[PDB]
Structure 1
Amino acid sequence: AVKKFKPYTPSRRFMTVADFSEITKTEPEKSLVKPLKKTGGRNNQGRITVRFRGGGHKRLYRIIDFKRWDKVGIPAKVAAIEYDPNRSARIALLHYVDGEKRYIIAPDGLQVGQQVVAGPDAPIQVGNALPLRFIPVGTVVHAVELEPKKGAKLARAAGTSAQIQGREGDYVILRLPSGELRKVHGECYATVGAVGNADHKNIVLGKAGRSRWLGRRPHVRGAAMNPVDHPHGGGEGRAPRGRPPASPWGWQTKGLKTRKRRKPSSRFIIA
């Protein structure tokens, strides 16, 4: 839905925020070895190596389960659906019959009360994980793994998802969120359903700050700087680049493909 505000102040006549009803029934994290001190920091060993990051509200890190083959067959009830500052997606706190509690990136549709489980035996329904091989071609899934046992790495952003296009050998063809067609091993797990909280792509930040609360500091334009700072910089009084769109480091930034050519990763891609 997204909450909108009356214009009782500019920057706030455009501002809009998430429908937090989805979450509710729990704001406090499941402390139980669930959150960890999380180190902030826009740089590595001294130098900033990603520009314009910093500041931004204090943040606790919830550790979530991205490889569910741990508890194969051990079912669990969905305790709650909480808020995670560290992601676009919302998480779900789930108590296992085992007694062990874990977190999972909350799929769309999942509800407090439902039961869930991962395994080959597992029933094909929202929240359940299984190797892609045992998932019916056509079903939508999220939190897909890339190589087996390596853990989930695909379709995890709010409202994202992958769809099975069909098997072919030990591999199964997935159409990824981006739209790429990749062959992924059949043993790679993946929980059924879409990522949920798809209204996300619609929230309008609103003001200059807030972009700040999210830890994103101002991004200054190339042309605005000087010959020394960027290739675009310079020229007496406003100019047009000067041919041909480039990054501060000098590589062309409009259309120039960048992924490695001889990458073995290919052969399993097509899109």
Structure 2
Amino acid sequence: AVKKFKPYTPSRRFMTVADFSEITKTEPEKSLVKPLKKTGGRNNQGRITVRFRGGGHKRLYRIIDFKRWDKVGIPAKVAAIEYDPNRSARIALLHYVDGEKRYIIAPDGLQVGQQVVAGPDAPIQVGNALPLRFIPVGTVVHAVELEPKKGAKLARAAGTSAQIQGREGDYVILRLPSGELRKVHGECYATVGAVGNADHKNIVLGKAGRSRWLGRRPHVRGAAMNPVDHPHGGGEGRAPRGRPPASPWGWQTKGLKTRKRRKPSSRFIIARR
């Protein structure tokens, strides 16, 4: 869990690569990949709408199953645990008995050979997925639906999870990985346990190039621009912001809240980040 390196170069000093022990299969499931279009952060008009992107490895997209409920009651055996370049986590390849192959995003604690199933039935065990209403309160759970049948949305990122705090009416009270407190509808599926590859946050990029491999290009500071360019540009040697700090588009960037206030989902929230 987290490879380190001798310092036989600079930057090989602080580098850290993930441990790949959990990985069973070294090439993906041909059935389950589509190629994906790399945007470079350019939207349909050829305009950059997210800065500092592009470069980075050719990448095959793995189509992963975010609705477990098409297969209700059909068991499946976990066939392998794989590397997915498109996400923080690991994907499990698993074979349904009725012969369909799907990718689940791998819970921690899941191992190859395990027997897994989703439905309002089903044991409470790692990898099984149920309607939220049927998980015992106090469970920790991942890959959670936010509206019934709409796809899993919350807690898909390596090492994240969420927790059932209580039930009220048609809805259950979820603690999100943000610490926000949310009612989610009881009918929403979720699959028990946390996401794993939790050691993920401790990997140390370690050198400039290695940030490029991830397709994120250099990020140049406001301060280091001119005034045509940023609210912080201009000013001889350095200078401080000399105004409350701002985005290139000139809104305030320290503490100013951007959530819409009159948003209808406010009726469903109790907490923050």
TM beyond 0.5: yes
- Whether the 8 Å contact between 2:2 and 2:16 is mirrored in structure 1 is yes
TM-score for the superposition, normalised by structure 1: 0.97
Q: Is the 8 A contact 2:4 2:17 kept in 1?
A: yes
User: In structure 2, do the counterparts of structure 1 residues 189 and 239 end up closer, same or farther at CA, with 3 Å as the change threshold?
Assistant: same
The alpha carbon displacement at 1:75 in A equals 0.5
- Between the aligned partners of 1:40 and 1:235, the Cα distance in structure 2 is 32
Q: RMSD of aligned C-alpha atoms?
A: 1.4
Deviation at 1:31, TM superposition (A): 3.6
Q: Which residue of 2 aligns with 1:260?
A: 260
Q: 1:23 & 1:231 partners in 2: Cα distance?
A: 47
TM superposition shift of 1:177? 0.2
**Post-superposition offset of 1:235:** 0.7
Shift of 1:145: 0.4
Quote the Cα distance in structure 2 between the aligned partners of 1:79 and 1:36.
25
Inter-partner Cα distance in structure 2 for 1:33 and 1:207: 31
For residue 269 of structure 1, report the CA deviation from its aligned partner. 0.4
How far apart are the structure 2 equivalents of 1:180 and 1:52? Answer: 30
Shift of 1:242: 1.4
Task: Tell me if structure 2 keeps the 8 A contact 1:26–1:80.
Answer: no
Bigger proportion of residues as helix: 2
Q: 1:39 to 1:72 in 2, by over 3 A?
A: farther
How far off its partner does 1:44 sit? Answer: 3.4
Is the 1:36–1:63 contact (alpha carbons within 8 Å) kept by the matching residues of 2?
Answer: no
Determine the C-alpha separation between the residues in 2 that align with 1:176 and 1:60: 30
Which stretch shifts more, 102-111 or 39-48?
A: 39-48
Q: Relative to 1, partners in 2 of residues 1:259 and 1:37: Cα closer, same or farther, differing over 3 Å?
A: closer
How many residue pairs get matched?
A: 271
1:34 and 1:65, CA in 2 relative to 1: closer, same or farther beyond 3 A?
A: farther
Q: Give how far 1:43 is off.
A: 3.7
Partners of 1:79 and 1:92 within 8 A in 2: yes
- The answer to whether the 8 A contact 2:16-2:204 is kept is yes
| Alignment deviations for residues 108-132 of structure 1 (CA, whole Å, 9 cap, x no partner) | 0000000100000011000001000
Deviation per CA, 1:113-170: give whole Å up to 9, x if none: 0010000001100000100000000000000000000010000000000000010000
Q: Distance in 2 between matches of 1:33 and 1:99?
A: 18
Cα offset for 1:213? 0.2
**Stretch of structure 1 that moved more, 161-170 or 21-30:** 21-30
How far apart are 1:236 and its partner, in Å? 1.3
Q: 5+ unaligned residues in a row in structure 2: which ranges?
A: none
CA distance in 2, matches of 1:208, 1:118: 43
Query: In the alignment, what sits opposite 2:209?
Result: 209
Q: CA 1:30/1:80 → structure 2, altered by over 3 Å: closer, same or farther?
A: farther
Does the 8 Å contact 1:131/1:188 carry over to 2?
yes
Identity %: 100
Could you list the runs of 5+ residues in structure 1 that have no partner in the other structure? none
Q: Distance in 2 between matches of 1:168 and 1:32?
A: 39
Q: Is the 8 A contact 1:64 1:102 kept in 2?
A: yes
1:33, 1:237 → 2: CA distance?
Answer: 52
Q: Against the structure 1 CA distance between its residues 32 and 180, is the aligned structure 2 distance closer, same or farther, given a 3 Å change threshold?
A: closer
Alignment TM-score, normalising by the size of structure 2: 0.96
